Design a protein around this ligand. Structure first.
Ligand code: A1BRO
Ligand code: ZN
Length: 139
């Protein structure tokens, strides 16, 4: 679990969105596994606006933050899970690192701010849903 809180927005994995998220919906995209809802209080996270390929992510199944090198956002085939059939997920970046299903939502960040959140994993890989192209999150 986990979310990004920027301005009056809450960014979560679409597959983990709550009923309150759907009832206060701003935008959602199943192909990216992202959903954004509106919040009453203002958030403290800042979104990175860069092309960094190194950063640090939070792994809840280890209570640890790990530094990683990650690929550029791309269209990647993701195997069938209990939340989605086997499909191509877009705007996804891969890194070598530990992940388990409940790790989705953990933040990946670089020197400029938040880059994205954990969305996929398995076999010593972790995939992050990028949010750096969503310029409207800052307005
Ligand atoms: C962090 O997730 C994992 C980590 C290790 C092993 C396996 C997993 C998950 N079975 C996983 O990859 N997904 C399940 C949740 C939906 C994901 C998606 N965005 O399509 C795919
Ligand atoms: Zn950066």
């Amino acid at each position: 679990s986990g979310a990004i809180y920027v301005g009056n927005y809450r960014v979560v994995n679409r597959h983990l969105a709550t009923h309150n998220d759907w009832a206060n919906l701003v935008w959602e995209d199943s192909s990216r596994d992202l959903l954004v809802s509106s919040t009453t209080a203002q958030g403290c996270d800042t979104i990175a606006r860069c092309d960094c390929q190194t950063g640090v992510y939070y792994c809840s199944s280890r209570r640890k933050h790990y530094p990683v090198s990650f690929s550029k956002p791309s269209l990647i085939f993701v195997e069938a899970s209990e939340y989605y059939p086997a499909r191509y997920q877009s705007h996804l970046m891969l890194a070598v690192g530990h992940s388990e299903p409940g790790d989705c939502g953990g933040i990946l960040r670089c020197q400029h701010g938040v880059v994205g959140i954990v969305s996929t994993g398995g076999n010593g890989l972790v995939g992050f849903a990028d949010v750096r192209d969503l310029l409207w999150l800052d307005e």
